[PDB]
């Protein structure tokens, strides 16, 4: 999102928000609304596993802001 | 450029106004500071010719040059960053949470002895520092001096102040009508007197001290001509019921600070050498003959006897005297003066027409006022 590539990303995001991108119709809404009322896949084999310790899975986490430069998403600056 | 200033300083709510300037707070984005930014235009809304614009630009560049000359002084205001655009001036300074000396003085009417002592000490320090660099401010006014959270006074308005050289004198006529020396009026009569000098700042300090102590400017009249004649004549007087309860050192300092003759006026170094600003911590060279010890013992006994009489010399309420004259009681006079000032505290701003001495009328409003 830095440098001269800032504009194409905004154009693609606006195309996604409009409703149709690349000849394909898409819908934009909150994740919680989309999840509710939808079919969910069940993976019950993990519970049946006899492993003493359940494996730990690392999920995507929010990246904390830096405390040295504090780049608060400045302009494109070509 | 302007883009760098915009990305570096964030305009905020207005903190002050001028003849053609607006003062607003700014925040230094890399540092999250609380500095102040001053915005002054060039064309004045298209109301003046480009000659006025170029004169204003020259004044601003002279101001920033003089300020950068004296940069680094903690007592003097500092110019952190300067910017120049086609139609706007951007300057960065240090913001203070306290107002100017005018606001504090009009709130407190009269300040304490320690406060006035430290204020004149700081003013003497800054003026002697300026003299060391051959700079004349000649615009020392109570409104033009500010304060901070530490009750420290910092001189500002350096747009007026310019560099000087030995052997040359200036001739411009200006300033507050009550803040002029006999030198300026002598020069401006027709052509006789050479020009400006150094003692203008000394009389500025004197009138500052007089205004802070007595609560009113030493010279004030309903007519411009009368007040300029009184200032030129140098016929100032000390109030009878106001200056009685003060130490003699302040009378002497004010008297030598208001001397009409520039040659006889005390220098800043001479003022600093006075015992009023002199302080002592500890010494071990106080040795003399037994005659000195006897004199010290006698003086100590005299001082003890003097303080032994302070409580018995106090006066009672004396309600009858209050009926005849409410000015006899100093606390009552101070209270009524403070109440009167609080009633009319919204008519004290810049301008010779209305000032603190307007509120006070010591002269009797009788047939004698007709004579002039």
């Amino acid at each position: 999102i830095r440098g001269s590539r800032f504009n194409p990303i905004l154009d693609m995001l606006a195309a996604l928000k409009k409703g149709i991108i690349g000849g394909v119709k898409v819908h934009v809404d909150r994740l919680q609304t989309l999840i509710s009322g939808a079919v969910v896949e069940q993976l019950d084999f993990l519970r049946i596993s006899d492993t003493e310790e359940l494996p730990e899975f690392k999920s995507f986490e929010e990246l904390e802001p830096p405390k040295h430069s504090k780049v608060k998403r400045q302009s494109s600056t070509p | 450029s302007a883009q760098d200033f915009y990305e570096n300083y964030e305009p905020k709510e207005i903190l002050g106004r001028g003849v053609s300037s607006v003062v607003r707070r700014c925040i230094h984005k890399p540092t999250s500071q609380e500095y102040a930014v001053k915005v002054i235009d060039v064309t004045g809304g298209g109301s003046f010719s480009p000659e006025e614009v170029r004169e204003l630009r020259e004044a601003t560049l002279k101001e920033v040059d003089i300020l950068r000359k004296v940069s680094g002084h903690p007592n003097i205001i500092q110019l952190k960053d300067t910017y120049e655009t086609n139609t706007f001036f951007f300057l960065v300074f240090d913001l203070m949470k306290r107002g100017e000396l005018f606001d504090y003085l009009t709130e407190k009417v009269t300040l304490s002895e320690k406060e006035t002592r430290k204020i004149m000490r700081a003013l003497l320090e800054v003026i002697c520092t300026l003299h060391k660099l051959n700079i004349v401010h000649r615009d020392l006014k109570p409104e033009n001096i500010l304060l901070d959270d530490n009750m420290n006074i910092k001189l500002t308005d350096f747009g007026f102040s310019c560099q000087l050289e030995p052997g040359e004198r200036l001739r411009e006529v200006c300033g507050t009508p009550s803040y002029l020396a006999p030198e300026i009026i002598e020069c401006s009569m027709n052509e006789d007197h050479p020009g400006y000098g150094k003692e203008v700042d000394m009389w500025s300090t004197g009138v500052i001290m007089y205004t802070l102590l007595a609560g009113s400017p030493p010279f004030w009249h309903r007519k411009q001509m009368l007040m300029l004649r009184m200032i030129m004549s140098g016929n100032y007087q000390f109030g009878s019921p106001e200056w009685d309860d003060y130490s003699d050192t302040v009378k002497d300092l004010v008297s030598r600070f208001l001397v009409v003759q520039p040659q006889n006026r005390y220098t800043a170094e001479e003022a600093l050498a006075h015992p009023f600003f002199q302080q002592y911590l500890v010494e071990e060279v106080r040795h003399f003959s037994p005659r000195g010890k006897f004199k010290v013992i006698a003086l100590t006994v005299l001082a003890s006897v003097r303080i032994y009489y302070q409580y018995r010399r106090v006066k009672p309420v004396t309600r009858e005297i209050v009926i005849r004259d409410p000015y006899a009681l100093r606390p009552l006079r101070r209270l009524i003066d403070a109440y009167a000032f609080r009633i009319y505290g919204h008519w004290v701003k810049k301008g010779q027409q209305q000032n603190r001495a307007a509120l006070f009328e010591n002269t009797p409003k009788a047939v004698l006022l007709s004579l002039a």
Binding site: - | S112, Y280, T300, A303, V305, I307, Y309, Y311
Partner: protein
């Protein structure tokens, strides 16, 4: 105008006024000095004296305040009254000197 000897005498008097060096004459030290001299001022009278001598209500006396108080002018009648009172206090014995 003052003198160096006068300044030294005032400093010595200020130092001797308080038993402990703290820059203040202190109400307790002044009361003890008064009792030692042979006087018993009232608490209200002492508080009134402290308030009158001081320029505000802080309730403490500094050396510049003492110097300013000693700088007052008694004129003529007050001076002779003061010296007569001092002589009477000093002349406790019935000798006339």
């Amino acid at each position: 105008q003052l003198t160096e000897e006068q300044i030294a005498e005032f400093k010595e008097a200020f130092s001797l006024f308080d038993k402990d060096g703290d820059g203040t004459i202190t109400t307790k030290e002044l009361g003890t000095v008064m009792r030692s001299l042979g006087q018993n001022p009232t608490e209200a009278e002492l508080q009134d004296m402290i308030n009158e001598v001081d320029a505000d209500g802080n309730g403490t006396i500094d050396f510049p305040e003492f110097l300013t108080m000693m700088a007052r002018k008694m004129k003529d009648t007050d001076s002779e009254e003061e010296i007569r009172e001092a002589f009477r206090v000093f002349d406790k014995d019935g000798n006339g000197y």
